[PDB]
Design a protein around this nucleic acid. Structure first.
Ligand SMILES: *O=P([O])([O])O[C][C]1O[C](N2[C]=NC3=C2N=[C]N=C3[N])[C]([O])[C]1[O]
Length: 639
DNA sequence: AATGTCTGCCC
DNA sequence: ATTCTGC
DNA sequence: GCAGAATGGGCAGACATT
């Protein structure tokens, strides 16, 4: 009966009925166009609550009509390929994608490239493209082609990905090509990501319980509730799903349990366990110690060195298997044979399993001192052998999430940290507890902040010990504070840099400039040397003003005294004129930027770590910008 | 063999 | 990673 | 304050090209 064309699917309508308002039939694969139309409706709105309801409508229809497609539809909505620990990646960026578009349309790659840049969205290019009879795309078919792309490996694999991609585009109808392309480029731009997908899912399976006989007698379990009881109930079901997901961020595990046992019984089937990465506790920036004392009020807190390495979530399973996961739940085990072989040394004989929250820091065993993050990044990644490791690592342990088969997630940090100290064993330069200070005295805190930089850290992490001090990400994901010198007004490295070029903006930046190429003044050669790009720190209004004043400085070709070497050629070369104050966290030795090359190193120039716009220096012309010699001086002052 | 470009993921 | 902003 | 979307530098690895 339901022969509604998916082109008319409207998951945003009032009084959405999961069966009758779907654009597909019970037992039919969810059409990809149904997902694209949901994306369109989500795009058109800015209230996340409207977005969540719209997605929820789609999901309720999937649960009611096509339950096996729930997982692909969710992954499509998250724009992921599977669980984060499986390390599946498309291996497709704008390069492979635009080359695929060019072939599907007959156009030259430069033309497509130029249009994508101007429109700021590869989706608009693929959609408005003449594709110089295939069945309609389904959600699971598209999902599975994405996974086919990601699995393609070896010589000629790029051509094989382009072929799959072209096959997708030739079957696309209406808005499908826009979202296929946006999916492949990695930016859906819905205004809706993981938190809203979770809210939509918990809402969907609460209103339309999975697993009923068809047609479901219970299509809207909110209908018997007052508005206020409905809100309270959806919030509680949502919290169940979110807290479970933060401990087990694996839809492949969660969805079957959801579909079979329902959401209220989810915690009984999915729990934190070693070997499945969990979502890490994150930190909010603070702009000074006073801000720390106020945000925390009367809560006792501790300060810890903020080490400059990579987060390493170390799992030791019952039975001895050791896994190491990144901050993003990627499996880094194969990267760290040195750490696996040192686990025996770090725990008492009674420790049978754990999840440790640590920072892996590059460590010079000769000098017994910390090495910079840049050195850490020269470690091999895949399938590393333990004897060939050149850059040793020292683990700085700061949290214990799971111990001897018990979750510590609801334990306050005071207790988790005590359990860390009591059950684990320090070895200098191999595994040590984060340097810490428990105080509320500004003097000691300021001094400790100073000491951490002198001890080659970035600053401090500040964490309450007992008040709201648990590790429950679903309750507050940014429960910690980070205090870095470069956050403090007038403390960090600031530079005055010449804007030499602009890059057309993507997404909401389309039609203006999203980034800028900046240069220092090389006094000796009287040239401007590219030092970094810049794309954060301006309000939207400033960004519109920058575009409006700088488009008048656009040059057809660059000045001959403007050296950019390996930096990305700007979309618009700009007459050097505008001078901007830029803050950064650090200077780095750069493989591409020419700024100050030969003043520290004969071949490498210098770039900025985490540059951000502070303000225009309308009082300066290019010759008053920070010089390359000063950039070198700053770099050496880092020691 | 060597080099250059693209990508994913660290921050 | 930093930063901005509509809700 | 959340959640999301803009955006930064730079590495190893995987390919492509020569
Ligand atoms: O938000 P940021 O990504 O800048 O910082 C969080 C990040 O810092 C790392 N870290 C180092 N030392 C730490 C620590 N986190 C928590 N406690 C201590 N002592 C860690 O990798 C975080 O992800």
């Amino acid at each position: 009966s339901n022969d509604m064309d998916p082109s008319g699917y409207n998951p945003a309508k009032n009084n959405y009925h999961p069966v009758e308002d779907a654009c597909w039939k019970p037992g039919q694969k969810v059409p990809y166009l149904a997902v694209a139309r949901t994306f369109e409706k989500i795009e058109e709105v800015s209230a996340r609550l409207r977005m969540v309801e719209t997605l929820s409508n789609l999901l309720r229809s999937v649960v009611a009509l096509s339950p096996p497609d729930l997982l692909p539809v969710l992954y499509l909505s998250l724009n992921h390929l599977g669980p984060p620990q499986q390390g599946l990646a498309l291996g497709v960026g704008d390069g492979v994608l635009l080359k695929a578009v060019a072939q599907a349309t007959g156009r030259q790659l430069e033309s497509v490239r130029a249009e994508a840049a101007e429109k700021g969205d590869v989706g608009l290019v693929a959609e408005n493209s003449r594709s110089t009879p295939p069945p309609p795309l389904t959600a699971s078919g598209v999902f599975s082609k994405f996974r086919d792309i990601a699995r393609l490996t070896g010589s000629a694999s790029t051509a094989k990905k382009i072929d799959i991609i072209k096959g997708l585009f030739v079957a696309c109808r209406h808005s499908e090509a826009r979202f296929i392309a946006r999916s492949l480029s990695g930016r859906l731009r819905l205004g809706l990501a993981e938190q809203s997908v979770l809210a939509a899912l918990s809402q969907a399976v609460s209103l339309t319980p999975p697993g009923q006989e068809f047609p479901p007698a219970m299509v809207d379990a909110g209908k018997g509730k007052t508005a206020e009881a409905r809100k309270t109930w959806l919030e509680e079901q949502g919290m169940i799903l979110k807290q479970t997901f933060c401990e087990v961020p694996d839809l492949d595990r969660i969805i079957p349990v959801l579909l079979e046992h329902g959401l209220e019984r989810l915690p009984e089937h999915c729990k934190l366990s070693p070997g499945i990465p969990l979502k890490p506790m994150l930190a909010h920036p603070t702009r000074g110690i006073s801000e720390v004392l106020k945000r925390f009020e009367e809560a006792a807190f501790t300060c810890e060195y903020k080490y400059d390495g990579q987060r390493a979530q170390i799992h030791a399973l019952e039975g001895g298997e050791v896994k190491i996961f990144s901050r993003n739940q990627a499996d880094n085990t194969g990267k760290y044979p040195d750490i696996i072989s040192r686990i025996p040394k770090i725990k008492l004989p009674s420790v049978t399993s754990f999840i440790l929250d640590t920072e892996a820091v590059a460590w010079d065993r000769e000098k017994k001192q910390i090495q910079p993050f840049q050195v850490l990044t020269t470690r091999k990644r895949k399938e590393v052998d333990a004897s060939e490791i050149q850059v040793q690592v020292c683990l700085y342990a700061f949290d214990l999430i799971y111990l001897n088969g018990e979750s510590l997630v609801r334990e306050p940090l005071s207790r988790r940290r005590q359990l860390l100290r009591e059950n684990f064993v320090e070895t200098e330069g191999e595994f040590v507890f984060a340097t810490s200070l428990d105080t509320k005295d500004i003097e000691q805190i300021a001094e400790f902040l100073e000491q951490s930089v002198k001890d080659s850290c970035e600053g401090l992490m500040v964490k309450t010990l007992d008040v709201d001090a648990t590790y429950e990400i679903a309750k507050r994901s940014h429960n910690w504070l980070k205090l870095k010198k470069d956050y403090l007004d007038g403390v960090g490295d600031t530079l005055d840099l010449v804007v030499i070029g602009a890059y057309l903006g993507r997404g909401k930046r389309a039609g203006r400039y999203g980034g800028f190429l900046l240069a220092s003044y090389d006094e000796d050669s009287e040239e401007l040397q590219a030092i970094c790009k810049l794309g954060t720190g301006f309000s939207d209004e400033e960004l519109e003003e920058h575009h409006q004043s700088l488009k008048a400085l656009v040059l057809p070709s660059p000045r001959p005294y403007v050296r950019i070497d390996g930096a990305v050629i700007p979309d618009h070369w700009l007459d050097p004129s505008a001078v901007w104050e830029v803050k950064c966290a650090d200077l780095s030795l750069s493989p591409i930027y020419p700024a100050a090359r030969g003043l520290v190193d004969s071949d490498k120039g210098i770039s900025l770590r985490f540059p951000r716009f502070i303000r225009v220096r309308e009082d300066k012309q290019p010759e008053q910008a920070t010089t390359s010699a000063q950039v070198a001086c700053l770099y050496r002052k880092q020691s």
